[PDB]
Design an enzyme around this catalytic site. Structure first.
Site, PDB file in Angstrom:
ATOM      1  N   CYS A  92       0.782  -1.223   0.000  1.00 59.48           N
ATOM      2  CA  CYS A  92       0.000   0.000   0.000  1.00 59.48           C
ATOM      3  C   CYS A  92       0.821   1.284   0.000  1.00 59.48           C
ATOM      4  O   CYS A  92       0.424   2.267  -0.617  1.00 59.48           O
ATOM      5  CB  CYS A  92      -0.969   0.000   1.174  1.00 59.48           C
ATOM      6  SG  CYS A  92      -0.197  -0.127   2.784  1.00 59.48           S
ATOM      7  N   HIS A 262      -1.724   2.281   7.546  1.00 59.45           N
ATOM      8  CA  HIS A 262      -2.006   2.053   6.129  1.00 59.45           C
ATOM      9  C   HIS A 262      -1.972   3.358   5.307  1.00 59.45           C
ATOM     10  O   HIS A 262      -2.487   4.384   5.744  1.00 59.45           O
ATOM     11  CB  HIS A 262      -3.341   1.325   6.021  1.00 59.45           C
ATOM     12  CG  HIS A 262      -3.899   1.241   4.637  1.00 59.45           C
ATOM     13  ND1 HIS A 262      -3.685   0.159   3.812  1.00 59.45           N
ATOM     14  CD2 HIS A 262      -4.730   2.067   3.963  1.00 59.45           C
ATOM     15  CE1 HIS A 262      -4.363   0.321   2.693  1.00 59.45           C
ATOM     16  NE2 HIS A 262      -5.005   1.474   2.760  1.00 59.45           N
ATOM     17  N   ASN A 282      -8.982   3.482  -1.724  1.00 56.89           N
ATOM     18  CA  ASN A 282      -8.181   2.433  -1.084  1.00 56.89           C
ATOM     19  C   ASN A 282      -7.413   1.548  -2.082  1.00 56.89           C
ATOM     20  O   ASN A 282      -7.515   1.719  -3.300  1.00 56.89           O
ATOM     21  CB  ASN A 282      -9.074   1.561  -0.184  1.00 56.89           C
ATOM     22  CG  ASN A 282      -8.433   1.237   1.144  1.00 56.89           C
ATOM     23  OD1 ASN A 282      -7.224   1.169   1.263  1.00 56.89           O
ATOM     24  ND2 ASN A 282      -9.251   1.034   2.145  1.00 56.89           N
TER      25      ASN A 282
END
Length: 317
Positions: A92, A262, A282
């Site tokens: 990520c 994240h 996301n």
């Protein structure tokens, strides 16, 4: 220390609770038949590390809008709508990085030229610099590697789009229990400095280089001005167990364990019923949240959302 990895995910009572409390958002079940190692590797960003300077936003005489959606401003730069999947790879940090980098090229390269920057090229070829591949990484250093060495093309898994397309397959976490449990596991793909056959230019030819890497101040206003003037940016925030259950509205952490850190890509903002927010996308596909996107409480460094915004500008010509 002794991190205990297991399973037995996000209950119903967690969902049900988040609803009965009436926060600014509503939950539901996003992940099904997933191993907690999965949910963890999903949050693959370390917080802090090597903040890149400070884009001293020239904010003074810049009447920003009340709401804004980068997808509506630069409609010819489709990379802005795209939602990706990091697989069971805490890639990520590389994702927010290349997702935004991809947009900005199309934006600054004359809002008319798209290319999907390879999250694979960065994930696998960076090094300790960016950290640990699929085990966590430094968002700051993604941008930095881009400026440093550059990144070739590379779209979604098995999309056959670009120099090196993400070889790490997604898991159907948002569906059926008859398939294999989604264990968040695996290793980082080996840096293969070579584009897939079919595509031409070569690898070296295909590498796009940024001009600089920088930190956007910890200021709602400043962040808004980076996005408006230059497009999406990459931020980060602490994921609690309640967030994985996000479905709609404006996220505000209620209950939940500190899953991890994240990274993200902020592309816009607004107010949803007296509730200011940030429009964010996301790296866990289009099935999670609202078509892959979610809205988080703005102007309060909520979950650290406004404390790790790094951005960059591409090299001209």
């Amino acid at each position: 220390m002794r991190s205990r990895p297991s399973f037995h995910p996000l209950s119903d009572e967690l969902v049900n609770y988040v609803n009965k409390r009436n926060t600014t958002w509503q939950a539901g079940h996003n992940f099904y038949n997933v191993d907690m190692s999965y949910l963890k590797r999903l949050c693959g960003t370390f917080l802090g590390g090597p903040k890149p300077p400070q884009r001293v936003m020239f904010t003074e005489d810049l009447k920003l809008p009340a709401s804004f959606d980068a997808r509506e401003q630069w409609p010819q730069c489709p990379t802005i709508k795209e939602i990706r999947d990091q697989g069971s790879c805490g890639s990520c940090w590389a994702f927010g990085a290349v997702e935004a980098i991809s947009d900005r090229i199309c934006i600054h390269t004359n809002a008319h030229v798209s290319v999907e920057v390879s999250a694979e090229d960065l994930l696998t070829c960076c090094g300790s610099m960016c950290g640990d591949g699929c085990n966590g990484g430094y968002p700051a250093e993604a941008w930095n590697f881009w400026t440093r060495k550059g990144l070739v093309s590379g779209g979604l898994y098995e999309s056959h789009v670009g120099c090196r397309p993400y070889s790490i397959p997604p898991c159907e976490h948002h569906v059926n229990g008859s398939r294999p449990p989604c264990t968040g596991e695996g290793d980082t793909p080996k840096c293969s400095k070579i584009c897939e056959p079919g595509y031409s230019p070569t690898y070296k030819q295909d590498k796009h280089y940024g001009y600089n890497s920088y930190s956007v101040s910890n200021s709602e206003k400043d962040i808004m001005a980076e996005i408006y003037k230059n497009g999406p940016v990459e931020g980060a925030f602490s994921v609690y167990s309640d967030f994985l259950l996000y479905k709609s509205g404006v996220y505000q952490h209620v209950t939940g364990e500190m899953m991890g850190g994240h990274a993200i890509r902020i592309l816009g903002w607004g107010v949803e019923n007296g509730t200011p927010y940030w429009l964010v996308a996301n790296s866990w596909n289009t099935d999670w949240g609202d078509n892959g996107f979610f809205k988080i409480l703005r102007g309060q460094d909520h979950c650290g959302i406004e404390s790790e915004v790094v951005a960059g500008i591409p090299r001209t010509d």
